[PDB]
Amino acid sequence: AFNNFIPELWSDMLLEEWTAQTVFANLVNREYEGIASKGNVVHIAGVVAPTVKD
């Protein structure tokens, strides 16, 4: 009967592309971001501990 008055509909929402879960940026250290607001190298120094004497 209704060849002309039953609509086809489009969802107003796009279906997201899946990709993969990202994890590594939460798992590594982020503390050097603050100093790194400028420049192109961060220099990171570590302590050589003083030795224990008898």
The helices-and-strands tally (H runs, E runs) of the chain is: 1, 0
Nearer to its own copies, 27 or 41 (CB): 41
Q: CB of 4: closest distance to its own copies in angstroms?
A: 5
Among residues 42, 47, 24, the alpha carbon closest in space to that of 32 is found at 42
Residues within the interface to its own copies (CB under 8 A):
2, 4-5, 7, 10, 39, 43, 45
- In the DSSP assignment, the letter for residue 24 is H
Amino acid at 25: A
Query: Measured from the CB atom, is 34 or 39 closer to its own copies?
Result: 39
Smallest separation, CB 54 to its own copies (Å): 25
